[model samples]
Target: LIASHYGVSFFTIQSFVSSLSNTSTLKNMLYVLSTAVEFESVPLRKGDRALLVKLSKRLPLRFPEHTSSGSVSFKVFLLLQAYFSRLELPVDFQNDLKDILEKVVPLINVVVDILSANGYLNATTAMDLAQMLIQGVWDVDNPLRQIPHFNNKILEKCKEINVETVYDIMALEDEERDEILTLTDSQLAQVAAFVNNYPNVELTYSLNNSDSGVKQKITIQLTRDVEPENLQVTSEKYPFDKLESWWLVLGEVSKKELYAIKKVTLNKETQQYELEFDTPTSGKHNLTIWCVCDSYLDADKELSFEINV
Candidate 1:
């Protein structure tokens, strides 16, 4: 009956609502709806606000007949309104939706308050929803959009508040904040190592004397920021008796098979290593070296670098 009248299957709405289990998913859905290029190609009508209202009213009631109170209905209504507001619909359409939202906002708030008080929603979800409500009402081009006088009033009232990045969303809890801080520190270190150190290491390409035509060479470079005593490098493919750190290179030209390259440790004072390879002849070949680090902290510290020949 719904499919016949609305020209969209009821099951489709059920599926869509079922998939929207969180704010992120809901936001993604709204984004798609707001930006679809060929929206008419899809089964649903594009920008049919009345159909959306009907769906918003009926979909929540389907879960449980008792759950279909004015407050619950209003929550769904305001959610759609906020989504449409974010889309920055035409001025007339915006005014129309605004009128409906004004009547529904209080009821939606009551429903959210009751749900939060009864533990139906987590504190994080409730807070996010409250922020969403405010954002929906404000409905600016971006979250950072300034409202001058209003923003000044908010800032003055909440002088202690500080928000620097999008990750501030995780700052609501101490545990989340600490975990993020630790992860960020590790990532920064790896990034430092890759950027500063990885490029300094020199690599050479040479043909092997053997039948294979592959070219390869080993290189060595020192790591930064660690105690000199803690530096260590070891490898089986190339032998270095007295160096602290070195990169080993091994290559094969036959059918481009996967080959292992080994690292050999040298004395910190020596800073040198031997290179041995089976060079391929009579054909053009490309030689590549790859390194994967466990953390970006090493890169940030400039402890990792690479050179290609």
Candidate 2:
């Protein structure tokens, strides 16, 4: 009956909440339990929001107090008192009993961090979820346990779906469309916003095409912020005939133009770059342009297009 309520511990109708966090069978199943007392991870991941509040709004709802409330649950008291009595120890075990009992709250915190990092638990309600589980963890009478113990079957199902990467959902194929879609609406929204802001490198130009008999201006802009030295613009000359079909501007663009673009100073505030060129094309000429940038942003996109001079 006790195990049925707080399943993380081996349930005995007669005793304490012994944590199953480190058991060989459960340790490999899922990470919703741990002995960690506090949050600790390099480049910590936590969400921001008032996800679920006022545990008091629900009758049994409440945060874990620094100390336990009232007396130790009767069954827990019954078991511990018997053992301490055998050793000639006090049956009125207050701190000694509570001390052994309160390990699960902080232990579960690390599990919370892992789930949130892997995109399982929502950030805003993370604090609430942790509190909810621990506060009611002692309430064996609730019948409806607020926190379910980590189920090994969860991993079994995920394995059947072949979902290996916890943080990346994009790579998931349509194997189990419905099952995979379990990622909540708000969680995917959070992920999409994060991937968008990260820096990227691409070649963007103001003057895409021009039929020129003299100097023409072209401005190259890099979208993502990058180190100055990391930006390397490379080029190759493309004759009029070699230009993409869209750039074939008939007789207007000549085949023989000689011009070179020079990189100007980068903008201090806007964080964009500029390039200029001069050409004397009798018929048509262009340069195929692309950019090579530092790997810090983990992105390097190349664009190829004909620029008529």
Candidate 3:
């Protein structure tokens, strides 16, 4: 369950949804690592989401200024405590409220990538599920989810049919479908009144140089599905060992030398396995990465780009 203070209001519901997705564990670390760039991107723009952006970076649910702003800080602070366990539980979080407000996207791609690495999400279905989530193709509450778009009949049908996730909705049976539509139109009309009052999240943002616009850092996103100890990834001659983790290929990719890299880290600030390094030299560089699924087997796809250092 999300912290009570950080209510799942519409403005910040996107972030809250990310946290809620980790129902099995406290993924506070992801709250920090999942970049806002991925979270605040096009998904919200494509559908009927204009108001979602206009409300901006504030808690859309909580209100009375104190409840809204105070809870935002409290929720952010609490997650920080959960992530950094050594700091003690229910932290005071004094003086740092402004800094801790950052959140994670909790995207479908990130979750499937981890699952794929662990051999759970097969290539065929991984991307399909990702698109289903990231694009909101199956959101029952989406105004455009039903054929007519914002049709009240869908909401009426949703009275007792509480199926979570798009997958579950798709699994509904024909009998259940008939039973849903069979609800009295009068009852459906009443539900419409309740949904119309759906609360909007209120927001407040800092203006004093707090605008973290246009980051200039470059990160090489490298992901290799982790399976079979025989699998080896080599580029810049990175070290390969069974115990290695997420941060592999450290130092420099400048020289054509083998740079040892690590894998299996639950990287929080970005997608795990991403190589964030400064480009020391400009011009062209022939970059080749070998995702060895089996020892000495598989082709190396080469893609070259110029990063002006």
Candidate achieving the largest lDDT: 1
lDDT of 1 by residue, 75-139 (tens): 33434444434443545445444433333223223333333233232222322333334334222
Model 3: lDDT equals: 0.30
Q: Is candidate 2 or candidate 3 better by TM-score?
A: 2
For 171-232, candidate 3 gives per-residue lDDT tens digits of 67977754544546675454333233211111111111211123233234433333223322
**What C-alpha lDDT values do all the predictions have?**
0.32, 0.30, 0.30
Candidate 1 regions exceeding 4 Å error are: 1-85, 121-123, 137-143, 146-309
**Best candidate per TM-score, number?**
1
Model 3 poorest 10 in a row by lDDT: 292-301
RMSD of 1: 22.5
What lDDT tens digits, residue by residue, belong to model 2 across residues 1-309? 011122333222111123222221222211223222211221111220111122123223232334232222222323222222222223333333334334433333344333323332122133333323322322122211111221245344656766443323344556464354445666545434433322343446667454644656666665434443322221111001110000101111122121332223332222444444445444434454433221111122344445442
Give TM per candidate. 0.24, 0.23, 0.20
- Clashing residue pairs in candidate 2 (N, C-alpha, C atoms within 3 angstroms): 212-309, 253-283, 253-284, 254-283, 254-284, 255-283, 255-284
Q: lDDT order of candidates, best first?
A: 1, 2, 3
